[PDB]
Chains A and B, each alone.
With several copies, the nearest count.
Chain A
């Protein structure tokens, strides 16, 4: 139909998506949203819907979670990161349901990644691989693992949650997580074990 109708449909869909992302999904009309997506993709305007979804998701991420992580980089930084990841996943569940009904045509014909993969990629680009968040996360994980190796006990399930989050963020396998985690961790372990062996060869014997 006319551009005004599709523009209004997209505007209301964007408002509903933003409301869902704001932890206010209690009154989400699934039937209405599914019908608007049907009448939107039916008229061969999937490119505009995909671009708008990407723009809305990246704007929401940069506005909310990029500020939240940087505001709490020292007070439960990893806990806040895990909470933000869980919230993003639980919103992207329904987001991916609707836009995966859409994706059955977009991911296939347009030959692009699915909306779940799109959300994972944009999260990786805007939060984990940020110019400041990445180095801070690396430094804090190295510090806590070194302190654990020193002898004192720290939280361990949290590190498992972070590693699982990075593995899921890989989205294809162990390409991003392996590098980002192991390589600084590999260097830290190398230096730590070299120093430990140097101390042990002089402070003890072969017995």
Chain B
């Protein structure tokens, strides 16, 4: 191999020459700023300077080149990267950095900024990044922007930059089958408002934008509104659209295929080859669709589903390369369509079984057996979904183990064996709450409306303690009627605007039975909503978690397994 010591010595000597200006022969003249540099470094880094000097043109012998349509700071950072290999990339100058990299055709900085932008893609810059990837060639960025823009924009459709988009880009966006919309009318009104941004600059594109939307809205309202905005005496558009909506037979999209499903993680691996797996139950389809494995079989993790219906994974441990397990603070995000876990910004401290709770757009991970264990062994930390970073919050006053947390009234409610503390994400403080009369642990709670339903606790039992936020008191309702001499595995969840329970029971010398019940809020009784047949759902285990979310049956595949 090439001697790295001599390579770094040569590089540092060249950078010293650059700083001291000894062997510089070519100077870059940009907006009156002198940039003394060499030809060898520029040729090695950029693919434009190699064609600027070794070309035989008038600049081959000229020692002063007036490089135009560039920026001084961008050129300076590119030169210093070429001279020392240090690329300081902030969150603002990456746009002009990519512009100058494409202008100068430098592959290394182009790849680096492409990776930075593939990491930086978020909701508030999705349309801007897609427009940037349409302007300057970037297939990878274009595809990532396609996916993220489709999802987040069809959720939001309010960005100001969406109005200033090319016709081809909008045709690609609207005609795609990856849009995430609960209805087919929101895309219609989004297209209408985009068209009405201008009057005559969009008339020619009117015949094309309607060609990608289904005819179910091409004969109903929002056709006379276009006639109102039609240019005067234009008889080539009204009669055109009058007899035009014959083709494009109505085909349902993919965004209207989201159903309230119970996502399960760390289930019992069907085949003994793997350790655990992830499955999902369909309360409506009455089937069990398989889910992608956790990233690097990440066990002992926590789940959260934001009001925007997004799944996240935090904490967990990976078997170190017989008992062998090491805890890692890696963070991941689940793609609802690609059926894969996209990595995100990792946490600061590793966790085991963390309680992920979403509130005000922030992901809160409370506790989880942190590595530190100092006097603040109860330190909790939130995540920024806008800036893609983690921020510490007010620590929990008391150290708790095997706890659960929910969000009610824009506040974080974490529950332990007998104590409860409410955290206000605004004042960043903890307030003492009501005290339970029973010592129970290893249970889960579901936030339904303005009440907290702590179900089960210790196997578990059928004890239920209902807490009211407005009343600030713990009261008993009833006990779930289950078979005696059994060990039910209770799982509290909210579904169909009602509090249902996923309770798996096992009898003596008998296999586990799956059944869910609907708890009557006013009657204080668990009614049999549906019985899960064992012909579709097999054993899941004991350390499995359940959460409420929506998934697409089309993108996912049915798990092939014998009843």
Interface residues on B, range: 20 to 34
Enumerate chain B residues within 8 angstroms of A28, measured Cβ to Cβ: 55, 57-59
Determine whether the beta carbon of A35 is less than 8 Å from that of B55: no
Min Cβ gap A136→B in Å is 32
Interface centre among A27, A97, A98, by most B CB within 10 Å? A97
The main secondary structure of chain B at its interface with chain A is loop
Enumerate chain A residues within 8 angstroms of B426, measured Cβ to Cβ: none
Enumerate chain B residues within 8 angstroms of A31, measured Cβ to Cβ: 52, 59, 65-68
Q: Report the separation of the CA atoms of residues A104 and B135 in the bound assembly, to the nearest whole angstrom.
A: 14
With both beta carbons as reference points, the residue of chain A lying nearest to B107 in the complex is identified as A104
Q: Report the separation of the CA atoms of residues A31 and B52 in the bound assembly, to the nearest whole angstrom.
A: 7
Q: Report the separation of the CA atoms of residues A93 and B56 in the bound assembly, to the nearest whole angstrom.
A: 9
Determine whether the beta carbon of A101 is less than 8 Å from that of B58: no
CB-CB contacts of B42-61 with A at 8 A, as 1s and 0s? Answer: 00000110011001111110
Q: Which of A30, A35, A90, A105 contacts B59 (CB 8 A)?
A: A30
Min Cβ gap A117→B in Å is 17
Min Cβ gap A163→B in Å is 27
Asked whether any CB of chain B lies closer than 8 Å to the CB of A94, the reply is yes
Enumerate chain A residues within 8 angstroms of B68, measured Cβ to Cβ: 31, 35
Enumerate chain A residues within 8 angstroms of B59, measured Cβ to Cβ: 28-31
CB-CB contacts of B66-80 with A at 8 A, as 1s and 0s? Answer: 111100000000000
Asked whether any CB of chain B lies closer than 8 Å to the CB of A193, the reply is no
Determine whether the beta carbon of B52 is less than 8 Å from that of A30: yes
Asked whether any CB of chain B lies closer than 8 Å to the CB of A177, the reply is no
Asked whether any CB of chain A lies closer than 8 Å to the CB of B105, the reply is yes
Min Cβ gap A88→B in Å is 15
CB-CB contacts of B134-167 with A at 8 A, as 1s and 0s? Answer: 1101010000000000000000000000000010
Determine whether the beta carbon of B103 is less than 8 Å from that of A97: no
Enumerate chain A residues within 8 angstroms of B134, measured Cβ to Cβ: 44
CB-CB contacts of A13-52 with B at 8 A, as 1s and 0s? Answer: 0000000000001111111001100100010100000000
Enumerate chain A residues within 8 angstroms of B58, measured Cβ to Cβ: 26-30
Asked whether any CB of chain B lies closer than 8 Å to the CB of A198, the reply is no
Q: Which of A27, A44, A97 contacts B55 (CB 8 A)?
A: A97
Asked whether any CB of chain B lies closer than 8 Å to the CB of A109, the reply is yes
With both beta carbons as reference points, the residue of chain B lying nearest to A97 in the complex is identified as B51
With both beta carbons as reference points, the residue of chain B lying nearest to A109 in the complex is identified as B137
Q: Report the separation of the CA atoms of residues A42 and B52 in the bound assembly, to the nearest whole angstrom.
A: 20
Determine whether the beta carbon of B55 is less than 8 Å from that of A94: yes
With both beta carbons as reference points, the residue of chain A lying nearest to B69 in the complex is identified as A35
Q: Report the separation of the CA atoms of residues A78 and B287 in the bound assembly, to the nearest whole angstrom.
A: 51
Determine whether the beta carbon of A94 is less than 8 Å from that of B139: no
With both beta carbons as reference points, the residue of chain A lying nearest to B136 in the complex is identified as A42
With both beta carbons as reference points, the residue of chain A lying nearest to B57 in the complex is identified as A28
With both beta carbons as reference points, the residue of chain B lying nearest to A35 in the complex is identified as B69
Known A-B contacts A31-B52, A35-B69; the reply to A42 vs B135 at CB < 8 A is: yes
Asked whether any CB of chain B lies closer than 8 Å to the CB of A108, the reply is yes
Q: Report the separation of the CA atoms of residues A85 and B280 in the bound assembly, to the nearest whole angstrom.
A: 55
Enumerate chain A residues within 8 angstroms of B60, measured Cβ to Cβ: 30
Min Cβ gap B388→A in Å is 30
Q: Report the separation of the CA atoms of residues A125 and B51 in the bound assembly, to the nearest whole angstrom.
A: 28
Known A-B contacts A31-B67, A38-B69, A101-B105; the reply to A108 vs B55 at CB < 8 A is: no
With both beta carbons as reference points, the residue of chain A lying nearest to B56 in the complex is identified as A25
Enumerate chain A residues within 8 angstroms of B69, measured Cβ to Cβ: 35, 38
Q: Report the separation of the CA atoms of residues A126 and B66 in the bound assembly, to the nearest whole angstrom.
A: 39
Q: Would you list 29 pairs from A and B whose C-beta atoms are within 8 A, ordered by A residue?
A: A26-B58, A29-B59, A30-B51, A31-B52, A31-B66, A31-B67, A31-B68, A34-B48, A34-B52, A35-B68, A35-B69, A38-B69, A38-B103, A42-B135, A44-B134, A44-B168, A90-B56, A93-B55, A93-B56, A94-B51, A94-B55, A94-B56, A94-B57, A97-B55, A98-B51, A101-B48, A104-B137, A108-B139, A109-B139
- The 3 tightest CB contacts between A and B, nearest first, are A28-B57, A97-B51, A105-B137
With A94-B56, A97-B55 given, name 9 new contacts (CB 8 A).
A26-B58, A28-B55, A30-B58, A31-B68, A44-B134, A44-B166, A93-B55, A94-B55, A105-B137
